[PDB]
């Protein structure tokens, strides 16, 4: 009737799921920076 | 059952939300470029 909560998500995973996609973010953006995606290929 | 086990299931959401700040940052990254190309050209 409520034995539900199966798997209610605690505030750990979402705080680690938040954590996790900001790191990937976060390598994401240095590594397009540092491959000049942001520069101009100004000729 | 020995499937109650929160492990996929909150798996799945820890994932889903992984995703979903993975989708959005990549969203705002070609948003943030696109304005910037505008500025440039835009010959002020």
Same mark, same amino acid.
């Given at each position: ?43 | ?9 909150? &798996?799945?959401? @820890? +994932?889903?939300?992984?995703?979903? *700040?993975?989708?959005?940052? &990549?969203?705002? @990254? +070609?948003?943030?470029?696109?304005? *910037? ?8």
């Amino acid at each position: 009737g409520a034995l539900e909560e199966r798997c209610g998500i605690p505030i750990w995973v979402v705080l680690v799921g938040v954590l996790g996609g900001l790191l990937l973010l976060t390598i994401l953006v240095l590594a397009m920076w540092k491959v000049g995606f942001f520069k101009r290929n100004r000729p | 059952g020995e499937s109650p086990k929160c492990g996929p299931d909150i &798996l799945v959401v @820890l +994932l889903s939300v992984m995703g979903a *700040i993975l989708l959005i940052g &990549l969203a705002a @990254l +070609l948003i943030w470029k696109l304005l *910037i190309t505008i500025h440039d050209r835009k010959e002020f």
